[PDB]
Amino acid sequence: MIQRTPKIQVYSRHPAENGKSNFLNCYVSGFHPSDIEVDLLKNGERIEKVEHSDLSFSKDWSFYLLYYTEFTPTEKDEYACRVNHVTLSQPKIVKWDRDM
Amino acid sequence: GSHSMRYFYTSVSRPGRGEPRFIAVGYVDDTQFVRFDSDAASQRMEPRAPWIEQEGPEYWDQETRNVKAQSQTDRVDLGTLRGYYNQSEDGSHTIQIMYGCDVGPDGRFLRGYRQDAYDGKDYIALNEDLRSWTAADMAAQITKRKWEAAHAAEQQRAYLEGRCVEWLRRYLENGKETLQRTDPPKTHMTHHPISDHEATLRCWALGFYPAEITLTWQRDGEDQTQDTELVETRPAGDGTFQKWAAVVVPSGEEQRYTCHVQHEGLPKPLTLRWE
Amino acid sequence: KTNGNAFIGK
C-alpha cells in the first residue's frame, strides 16, 4: 500500500532552565503504517522509563504518537530522539535544540 | 463556544503473530478522556481525564463491552476486506474508524460523523445528512449494499443525534472547570543568523488550548509562503499545545516582517515583530 | 459514550 514517513519533533514541555524539572518530548506524526520504533536518547544512550500516548490519527488517516520522559536539563547533557519506520532506510536521529 | 466528541479506533492485523491489535481512544475537543488497548493488561475501557473517573461501574462495563465487540467486528472485517481486494494472508492490514458529533455554543446538535478507512485510505463514509453512505471504490460498494439492507445509516443517526450529543453535553458539564477554558498562546520571537547576509526569524506560540491556531508571516504587509517553514501543532504533554513558523530574511531587513497570531483564547489577534 | 448499535459486518 501507500506508506507515509513520520515527521519528528524533539522539544521540552516547558521552556528549558538548567536544574529545573521538565519533560522531554518526541512527537511523531503523519506516518502510515502504525508500527514505529521511538527511543529517547541521553548522550547517545537509550533512556529507560519512557512513556507514550495511545495511538490516534488525523483527518488524512495518518498516525501520531507522543513519547515522553521526565528530565532535568543541564548545559552539558545532549538529548535526542531515534526513530525507525518501514519508510526509513535507517534510523533517523533528531537532536533536541533548546535555543530554536 | 462549539465542542466535539470523537472516537478513533484502529485495528492492525499481524499474520502469524496472533490476533489483530485493537486500540480505541475517546476525545472531547482536544482532551483525551478514555482509552482501550487490546494488548494492555486491564482488558477494560480506562479513564484518561479526571472528570470521567466519577462514572459508575455500569458505565465502564458497557464501554468495555462495546470496544470488545468493536474489536471482534474489525477482526472479521479484516478477513472480509482482504478477500474483496484479493490480498494475501501474509501482509499486515489496517482498519480505522472515526465517529462523533459536534455541538454549537447554545448546545444544539450541529453535525455527526462516521468515517471508515482501509490501509490508510477512505473506504466508506456516512454523508452529512446521516441518511446515506459514500463508498470510495467497488469493494466499498459491496459494504454499502449490506449497510443499506441493515439500516446502518438509521443506526448511526440514532446514536449521533441521541446518545452522542447527550453524553457530550453531560461531559461538558462534568468537566466544566477544564473543558470550557481557553488558554491563550504565550508568544515570543527568536532570531538566528544563518550567514553574513541572511537570518531566520522564528515566531513561537506556547501553552495554548484548544489546538486550533494560525501563525502568518508578512513582509511589507504581503503574505509570505516563500521560506515560511510551519511545523505541525504539537502537544506539550500537560494538555496544552505548541507551534512555530519561521522565515528566512535578508540581514538588516528583520523589521520589514511581522508574524500574526490568531487563537480563540486571545482577546484580540497578536502581531509580533523583531525589535 | 461509545456506539454499541452498529456492529454490522462490512
The CATH number for B230's domain is 2.60.40.10
Closest chain C CA to residue B28: C1
When divided into structural domains, chain B yields a total of 2
Answer yes or no: do B156 and B200 share one domain: no
Answer yes or no: do B38 and B168 share one domain: yes
Contact of A14 with A30, CB cutoff 8 Å: no
Identify the DSSP state of B232.
Answer: P
Q: Report the amino acid identity of residue B102.
A: D
Query: Per the structure block, which three cell numbers stand in for A19?
Result: 536544574
- Residue that finishes a domain, picked among B132, B164, B180: B180
Asked if residue B210 has a cis previous peptide bond (ω within 30° of 0), the answer is yes
Answer yes or no: do B138 and B257 share one domain: no
Answer yes or no: do B87 and B152 share one domain: yes
Contacts of B118 (CB under 8 A, 6+ apart): B81, B85, B93, B94, B95, B139
> Method of determination?
X-ray
Query: With contacts defined as CB-CB under 8 Å, which chain C residues touch B26?
Result: 2
Q: Is B98's CB within 8 Å of A33's CB?
A: no
Identify the DSSP state of B41.
Answer: S
Query: Per the structure block, which three cell numbers stand in for B21?
Result: 491489535
Distances (CA, A) of A31 to A36, A49, A64, B45, B64: 9, 24, 7, 26, 28
Answer yes or no: do B81 and B19 share one domain: yes
Answer yes or no: do B94 and B176 share one domain: yes
* Cα separation, A34 vs A1, whole angstroms: 13
Contact of B203 with B187, CB cutoff 8 Å: yes
Answer yes or no: do B45 and B125 share one domain: yes
Query: Per the structure block, which three cell numbers stand in for A5?
Result: 514517513
Neighbours of A72 (CB within 10 A): 12
Closest chain C CA to residue B70: C7
- Residue that finishes a domain, picked among B180, B212, B247: B180
Please give the residue range of the domain that contains residue B207: 186-273
Strand B109-118 relative to strand B121-126: parallel, antiparallel, unpaired?
A: antiparallel
| Kind and range of the H or E run holding A57 | strand A56-57
Q: Is A9's CB within 8 Å of B234's CB?
A: yes
Asked if residue A33 has a cis previous peptide bond (ω within 30° of 0), the answer is yes
When divided into structural domains, chain A yields a total of 1
Contact of B227 with B257, CB cutoff 8 Å: no
In B114-143, the residues whose Cβ lies within 8 Å of chain C are: 116, 123-124, 143
Q: Which long-range contacts (CB under 8 A, 24 or more apart) does B184-188 make?
A: B184/B208, B184/B263, B184/B265, B184/B266, B184/B267, B185/B213, B185/B243, B185/B261, B185/B263, B185/B265, B185/B266, B187/B261, B187/B270, B187/B272, B188/B272
Answer yes or no: do B123 and B209 share one domain: no
Sign of CA dihedral C3, C7, C8, C10: positive
- Residue that finishes a domain, picked among B180, B210, B238: B180
Sheet holding A45-46, edge to edge: A45-46, A37-42, A79-84, A92-95
Q: What is the least distance, in Å, from the CA of B189 to any CA of chain A?
A: 10
* Cα separation, B2 vs B106, whole angstroms: 8
Please give the residue range of the domain that contains residue A70: 1-100
Q: Which of B4, B71, B231, B240 to mutate to test the interface with A (most CBs of A within 10 A)?
A: B231
Contact of A99 with A14, CB cutoff 8 Å: no
**Which single residue is written with the C-alpha cell 545532549?**
A78
Query: Per the structure block, which three cell numbers stand in for B110?
Result: 450541529
Q: Which of A21, A40, A55 to mutate to test the interface with B (most CBs of B within 10 A)?
A: A55
Q: Which of C1, C5, C7 to mutate to test the interface with B (most CBs of B within 10 A)?
A: C1
